[PDB]
Amino acid sequence: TDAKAFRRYIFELYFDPARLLELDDDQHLQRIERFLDALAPLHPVLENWYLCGDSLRDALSHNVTEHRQDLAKALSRDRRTRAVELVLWNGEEDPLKGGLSLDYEASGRAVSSRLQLEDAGSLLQVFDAPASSFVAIFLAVLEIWPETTWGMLAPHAYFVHQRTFPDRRSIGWIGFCPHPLRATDFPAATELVDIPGRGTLLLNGREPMDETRREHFERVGEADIKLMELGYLPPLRG
């Protein structure tokens, strides 16, 4: 449901920088194309994808889902340390209606080789069942990018100020851990989805996390502690 004051959310997926760097311009563009195809059935705002622009009108000139040949136009290639960079947005201006953008950068550094969607909070406005729909996106990335080493869907307010280990990443509300995990070691309402030989998807509840109610806060904190205790919680810069 559309609300007046919603929650900013980070939606990030990290990759192995070494392996992803060696993909050429052609392999990158098939990954993004498949990704947009997996997003399309989840909601009508995720069907179309437009290009970035200097103004609002300049950002609606080219539709990369209607004109597919124009997808190659949005891929950069640095001369020193080849680094591809791709930024789209879906075409909605208001986050309260689903305005969201796709930022896909792979330069070869661990911190700079990621994929993210600006303001996952816009998707919370449109998703009836946010849990099933967000898991779909995670499984899409893992299906398309085998180089994935991490993933985190968490409130921006939590992850910046309130997270348990400030020198580490977090699993967030829905995170990907590239290891086999044990349902015993986690809170009861925390449920796991093993990927054959790829890793585990954590879901700290099926209800969207909140940073003002203690029932949600302790659930991902215990989850983060067990991941650190097992040595699977990565640091920020790396």
Partner: protein, 171 residues
Amino acid sequence: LPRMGPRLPFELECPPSRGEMAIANDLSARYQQWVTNFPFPHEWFWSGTWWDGFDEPRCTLLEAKANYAFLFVPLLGVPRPWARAKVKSDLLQKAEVHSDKARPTPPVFVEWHFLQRIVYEYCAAEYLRMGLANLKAFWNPMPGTDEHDDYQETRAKEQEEMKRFCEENPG
């Protein structure tokens, strides 16, 4: 409790002094002159990197950013979706390359001074989640602007909030 900005001197251990002034390729221009006291378009070129200003006494490199609020939704606190490419390359990437290009982190600090508040608010949070320890962000607006107005009354409402709290308590 927004970060208090120091003042700036004039010009013409801390390595950046091994750089010099170069020419870079007018509300934005005025605000950088007000933050840096650097003449015309001169900027500090050190470590192969551009810096808007340089406080040699305080051993601090300076940068000024103005006119970037139209790229944001002023109440939700996020950039407009179509403007995510500009915010990345202009405000986030250039701020990482700056934190990366400082070596003696004890004496060499970097400061990013924003004319506009919602631009400061977004950047300050995004800089903390990036691991940018030696980069601090300031809402340091040049006078004769709506912002300077909301700046004066914000620090006034802090001394007011501090006036009541302090005289009724130990702290």
